[PDB]
Specification:
This protein is an alpha+beta fold and 291 residues long. It contains 10 helices and 10 strands. Homodimer; homodimerizes following heparin- and ligand-binding. Interacts with CBL, IRS1, PIK3R1 and PLCG1. Interacts with FRS2 and SHC1. Interacts with PTN and MDK.
């Protein structure tokens, strides 16, 4: 059985919390594998492994479980446990009833029907939440490699919502795929060119996430293909501000997208700047566009 190393500690399959299959009930459904709402009474999300899978799929599933179980931070989704001794195999996760952030932003855009569905402060709180999770990863020397709205989840649709990093499939693949499947639109020049990844890698990606958030769920680099973005970004090109985006927020993005990694802020600094934006009445009193 493969081992996993995080924060200088080594863990094994043996260390995962095995939940007896009889204690787990699937309630309703919600790539590779399906996700269900379940009960263990503890409400959970259940990720399944297809019984029809390869040996590599099995090891991938196991590794995902090990990685997530070893994190301990409020802005990273919790792993409640596993059921790997029965088929199909399960991973039991914190239930995130708000769903993924990209879908949420698109579905919850201000509308003539829902004129006040979202405000600038909601977006800043989501950004802060994810930045706090990224800071935890950075201080523990874990490089995520795929920070993006589709990989963040919300605890609930409503006002008390908390955003958390909820998918680690890229980091898993790299720990042990194809060019067309690479998240090139979230990647800094040195990553897609030299294959060099550092904590500054995630800073660049976080800048793109910020654009996703303040555009309310638009695909990055509108109208550009992956290769067109690669050439654009390599030549110094950067995205324009999202519609109605406050200047202080856009400035955070442009700092995250500095060509040289040593010129980009660490997440401690990013958090400070997000905090300062949240304090500025002129930022938070800016109206979002109505769809």
């Amino acid at each position: 059985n493969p081992n996993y190393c995080f924060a200088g500690k080594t863990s094994s399959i043996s260390d995962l919390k095995e939940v007896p299959r009889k204690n787990i009930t699937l309630i309703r459904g919600l790539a590779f594998g399906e996700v269900y709402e379940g009960q263990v009474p503890l409400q959970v999300a259940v990720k399944t492994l297809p019984e029809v899978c390869s040996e590599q799929d099995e090891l991938d599933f196991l590794m995902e479980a090990l990685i997530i179980s070893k994190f301990n931070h409020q802005n990273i989704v919790r792993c409640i446990g596993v059921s790997l001794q029965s088929l199909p195999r399960f991973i039991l996760m914190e239930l995130m009833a708000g769903g993924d952030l990209k879908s949420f932003l698109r579905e919850t855009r201000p509308r003539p029907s829902q004129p006040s569905s979202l405000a600038m402060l909601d977006l800043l709180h989501v950004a802060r939440d994810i930045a706090c999770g990224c800071q935890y990863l950075e201080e523990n020397h874990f490089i995520h490699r795929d920070i993006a709205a589709r990989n963040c989840l919300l605890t609930c649709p409503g006002p008390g919502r908390v955003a958390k990093i909820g998918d680690f499939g890229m980091a898993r693949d790299i720990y042990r795929g194809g060019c067309a499947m690479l998240p090139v639109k979230w990647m800094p020049p040195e990553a897609f060119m030299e294959g060099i990844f550092t904590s500054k890698t995630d800073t660049w990606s976080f800048g793109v996430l910020l654009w996703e958030i303040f555009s309310l769920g638009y695909m990055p680099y509108p109208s550009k293909s992956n290769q067109e973005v690669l050439e654009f970004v390599t030549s110094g090109g950067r995205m324009d501000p999202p519609k109605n985006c406050p200047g202080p927020v856009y400035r955070i993005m442009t700092q995250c997208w500095q060509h040289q990694p040593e010129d980009r802020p660490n997440f401690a600094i990013i958090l400070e700047r997000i905090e300062y934006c949240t304090q500025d009445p002129d930022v938070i009193n800016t109206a979002l566009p109505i769809e």
